[PDB]
Design a protein around this ligand. Structure first.
Ligand code: NA
Ligand code: NA
Ligand code: NA
Ligand code: NA
Ligand code: NA
Ligand code: NA
Ligand code: NA
Ligand code: NA
Lengths: 150, 151
């Protein structure tokens, strides 16, 4: 009886004592679908990475209508709670809907985004055949790192 | 292409309040097979639960020749590193043989043993259909309790 759930939670500042601080969120997937490699995952990503994802998806799916992202950074201010809640909600909604689409669901880009440590650049490398390691290997390796597996 | 790897590790003495107490071991599965629900799992089980398991598996597969469990039990002294380790070895060997067998691999008692927290009365209840939760529900809740998943 297939299901997929997604939560965006836990807004946290990164590189706070640097110039170039940013915010990121935890993305938690729970699913029983054959579509995913891992039935659970928690991963941390920033808005600019959602933006990358959205555009990568659109580019491989000419005619799909991608859901919206929330307020661009330019109009975001972490000192305003409302901004950080809205950004989180909007990012949850974006993924919820994306996940509802079978065609998108078959994009390994979405999968490494959700169930791996890999950044934009390495995702593109990996799914474009250019890496030592497969998509599965990356996701598995992430899981082990992330669950501190012995 | 498909692997299943099992380790039995990190024995620890656990203390019922008590005069008496026991050792349990950690069991860690890493696989990509469709046979398993969770691609990784860590649970802790004691030797006596392994005993339970072997007899359970035997009764759902009566023509299968089950691997032997290790055999110091009465002798066994939980304060002798060699005792405890000769036993984790044995429990590891037991399971890695067990998992090589597709008949045994389809018993949900083995899966709830490896990938959930349920004890044997509840495993039994659950595979008999006497519990509100399915087999899969239990494995999924264990993963979530155990991966301190947010709600
Ligand atoms: Na959802
Ligand atoms: Na996946
Ligand atoms: Na995730
Ligand atoms: Na658009
Ligand atoms: Na093995
Ligand atoms: Na396990
Ligand atoms: Na399983
Ligand atoms: Na009942």
């Amino acid at each position: 009886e297939e299901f997929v759930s997604v939560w965006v939670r836990d807004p946290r500042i990164q590189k706070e004592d640097f110039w170039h601080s940013y915010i990121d969120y935890e993305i938690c997937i729970h699913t029983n679908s054959m579509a995913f490699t891992m039935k659970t995952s928690c991963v941390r990503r920033r808005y600019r990475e959602f933006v990358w994802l959205r555009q990568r998806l659109q580019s491989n799916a000419l005619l799909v209508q991608l859901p919206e992202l929330p307020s661009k950074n330019l109009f975001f201010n972490m000192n305003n709670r409302q901004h950080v809640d809205q950004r989180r909600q909007g990012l949850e909604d974006f993924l919820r809907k994306v996940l509802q689409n079978a065609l998108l669901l078959s994009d390994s880009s979405l999968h490494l985004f959700l169930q791996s440590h890999l950044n934009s650049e390495d995702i593109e490398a990996c799914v474009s055949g250019q890496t030592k390691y497969s998509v599965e290997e990356a996701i598995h390796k992430f899981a082990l790192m992330n669950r501190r597996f012995p």
